[PDB]
Design a protein around this ligand. Structure first.
Ligand SMILES: [Zn+2]
Lengths: 594, 184
């Protein structure tokens, strides 16, 4: 029986990988809660004992033939095990590669842009360089904080990234992938039925096809953003060219959410802001997460565990704990789920208190799956569960029943645009930047972009795709793409493009089971146990089924659709046309601010 | 005298699943009234064959008590006609099992940094009703027997529970003690 030899091999794995990765994740938790020299050595030794167990069991899994296995449950577990382990890199280069990844994270985290007039005061990005880039409107002040981050963290990361694209390329060729970009397009890889089949190169065909349909909505959005920002920047914006890349939202221009004080459709209407409302009421950091539990439990999803509140670091601790506090939803294993996030009470953290609580109730859902099938259906499925809760909670009808909004806040025809334009800056405003950052790196790892033409084709794709132009000329001595957190710390960035397409494809599927009669942006799936049983049916499979089958049984479509995204903004896309009649819809590549 | 349930319910140290300890209790009188309303601590008080409140009037001879520690979601496998890992390799109860399987959470006490609880997880056969497999620390082969860990198809049976106090519910130590009320 070839099945039972591989059945008991996984039972040998699942009864030993569960304890070895739980001590690996507890040592990872201790590094991420208080950084010390005694915590890093406990982290990597447990992290290499689990890595030694990662590669030893992978070699034993390759002795099993997938053709003689006629059970799809254990074939998929063997497929992960046979195709993850034993890199082709030598002992010297693996220490070289781990030195680089620990240097690019150290340069990005400990890097700081000091003022050229006085280098004594110097912002280490937290706090600093985001209140400046998120609230200030001066052209000559944001130019310092943007170019300075491309200078201190740019020149110190370009030689580390030029060796990063070689060692990781050679590491990816050890698994017989062609490049490192093809190593990242394996969460979307699907083998199975011929109709429900998704190749690694069909992702590049589909994502380019989707952006050809986003761009009618984005260019009308980009024209209205440029017209409204022309009043705030009367001298440094051409009325028909590209926007400056440093005046948009965040520092890198990822989200446009900080432009809503400037680009506002109706300034005479009251805001939908919840930041001032929470501070005026009895609302602590527990009720940031306690009220978010009430939304998930209203639709039939289970409560948080009793050990969730005791073990998670929901707030920044005192007593001088040096903690990197990037918001991450930890699944430590053995039924233990935690959140590591230092919350600051605003509108942004209230939605990421559902995003990080969106990985939870997904990690809680596939706990009945085997250990290797305990991820999302892809990497875009995992990030879209939290953000589809950012569409039903952020509605003014749900905030009125929450009590955080005033009962006299009438939903006029002008407040249907103020909420919808704020959802266009966060969600539609990040789609071109997320696409080309995973189109620049997919060509850098392939070899379509040579190393002497990195920054040349980086900005040539910023102008053509996103519609942004550099305020200062950049040669090849700078590395602007590696200034982001997800690029310097070796993270896949195609999650945030594909989850957005799934953010509204899930949403329009949930609002037809919840029997919502009206527009898509007015939908609210709260207090509906029928729109949570179909969601939990999607969540409980994990990675057991291909994501083209999980999507087909949930939204009744096989491939990625952008029609649900366009129908969400169809009340806005009609309003964006009548405001862009006088202005020009488009951008010119040849214009330069300098 | 009274019934020695202090050494069963309130013992200092409980064993693991495979090496469970059997205590034969006979000719005793017990106060089942205070054990009937002890639901503030006992997470599981399922009974089979007899009512929970009617067994005090009935006189039982040679009452057995099999006490051990399993994880939180392994208390479902201490039921008659139940299939699973520890219901077939560690501790199997017959279909005519009469009595009350009693379990309660012990995450504070039985989940320290020095304790170690194991389960069988690998055996060539089905465990008989009320059969205690001895502490056989010998490597299980997929076919026949093996010698060392490096041989293919050769896995060690006794996989330990990762009992830390920070694990979630279901993977927390539950002290399970059955009361096989044999009659006549
Ligand atoms: Zn996330």
């Amino acid at each position: 029986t070839p099945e039972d030899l591989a059945k008991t091999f996984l039972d040998d794995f699942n009864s030993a990988a569960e304890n070895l990765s739980y001590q690996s994740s507890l040592a990872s938790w201790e590094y991420n809660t208080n950084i010390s020299d005694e915590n890093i050595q406990k982290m990597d030794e447990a992290g290499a004992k689990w890595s030694d167990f990662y590669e030893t069991q992978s070699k034993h899994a390759k002795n099993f033939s997938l053709e003689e296995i006629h059970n799809d449950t254990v074939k998929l577990q063997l497929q992960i095990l046979q195709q993850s382990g034993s890199p082709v890199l030598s002992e010297d280069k693996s220490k070289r590669l781990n030195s680089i990844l620990n240097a690019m994270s150290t340069i990005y985290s400990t890097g700081k842009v000091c003022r050229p007039n006085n280098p004594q005061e110097c912002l280490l990005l937290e706090p600093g360089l985001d209140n400046i880039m998120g609230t200030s409107k001066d052209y000559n002040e944001r130019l310092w904080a943007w170019e300075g981050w491309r200078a201190e963290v740019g020149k110190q990361l370009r030689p580390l990234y030029e060796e990063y694209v070689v060692l990781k390329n050679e590491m990816a060729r050890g698994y017989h992938y062609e490049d490192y970009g093809d190593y990242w397009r394996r969460d979307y890889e699907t083998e199975g039925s011929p109709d429900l089949e998704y190749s690694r190169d069909q992702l590049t065909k589909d994502v380019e096809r989707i952006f050809a349909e986003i761009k009618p909505l984005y260019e009308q959005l980009h024209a209205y953003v440029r017209a409204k920002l022309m009043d705030t920047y009367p001298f440094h914006i051409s009325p028909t060219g590209c926007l400056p890349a440093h005046l948009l939202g965040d520092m890198w221009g990822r989200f446009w959410t900080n432009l809503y004080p400037l680009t506002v459709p109706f300034g005479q209407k009251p805001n939908i802001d919840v930041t001032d409302a929470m501070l005026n009421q009895t609302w602590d950091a527990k009720r940031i997460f306690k009220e978010a539990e009430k939304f998930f439990v209203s639709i039939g999803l289970p409560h948080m565990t009793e050990g969730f509140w005791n073990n998670s670091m929901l707030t920044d601790p005192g007593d001088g704990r040096k903690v990197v506090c990037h918001p991450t939803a930890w699944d430590l294993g053995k039924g233990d789920f935690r959140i590591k996030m230092c919350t600051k009470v605003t509108m942004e953290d209230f939605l990421t208190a559902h995003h990080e609580m969106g990985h939870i109730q997904y990690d809680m859902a596939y706990a009945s799956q085997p250990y290797l099938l305990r991820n999302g259906a892809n990497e875009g499925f995992h990030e879209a569960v939290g953000e589809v809760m950012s569409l039903s909670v952020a509605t003014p009808k749900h905030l009125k029943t929450m009590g955080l909004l005033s009962p006299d806040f009438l939903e006029d025809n002008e407040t249907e645009i103020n909420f919808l334009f704020k959802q266009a800056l966060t969600i539609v405003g990040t789609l071109p930047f997320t696409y080309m950052l995973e189109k620049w790196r997919w060509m850098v790892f392939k070899g379509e972009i040579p190393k002497e033409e990195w920054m040349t084709k980086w900005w040539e794709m910023k102008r053509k795709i996103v519609g942004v132009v550099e305020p200062v000329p950049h040669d090849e001595t700078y590395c602007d793409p590696a200034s982001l957190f997800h690029v310097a710390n070796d993270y896949s960035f195609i999650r945030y493009y594909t989850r957005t397409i799934f953010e509204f494809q899930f949403h329009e599927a949930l609002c037809r089971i919840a029997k919502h009669d009206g527009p898509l942006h007015k939908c609210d799936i709260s207090n509906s146990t029928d729109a949570g049983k179909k969601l939990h049916q999607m969540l409980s499979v994990g990675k057991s089924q291909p994501w083209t089958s999980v999507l087909k049984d949930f939204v009744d479509s096989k491939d990625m659709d952008v029609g649900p995204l366009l129908r969400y903004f169809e009340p806005l896309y009609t309003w964006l046309k009548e405001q862009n009649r006088n202005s020009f819809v488009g951008w010119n590549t040849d214009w330069s601010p300098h | 005298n009274l019934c020695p349930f202090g050494q069963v319910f309130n013992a200092s140290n409980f064993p693991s699943v495979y090496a469970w300890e059997r205590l034969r209790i006979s000719d005793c009188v017990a106060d089942y009234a205070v054990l009937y309303n002890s639901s503030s601590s006992f997470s599981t008080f399922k009974c089979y064959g007899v009512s929970p409140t009617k067994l005090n009037d009935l006189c039982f001879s040679s009452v057995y008590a099999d006490y051990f520690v399993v994880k939180g979601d392994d208390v479902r496998q201490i039921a008659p006609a139940q299939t699973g890992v520890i219901a077939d390799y560690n501790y199997k109860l017959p279909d005519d099992f009469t009595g009350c399987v009693l379990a309660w959470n012990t995450n504070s006490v039985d989940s320290k940094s020095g304790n170690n609880f194991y389960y069988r997880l690998f055996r060539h056969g089905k465990i008989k009703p009320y059969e205690r497999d001895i502490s056989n620390v010998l490597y299980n082969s997929a076919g026949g027997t093996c010698s060392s860990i490096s041989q293919l198809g050769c896995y060690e049976p006794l996989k330990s529970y990762g009992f830390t106090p920070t694990v979630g519910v279901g993977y927390q130590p539950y002290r399970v003690v059955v009361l096989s009320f044999e009659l006549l």
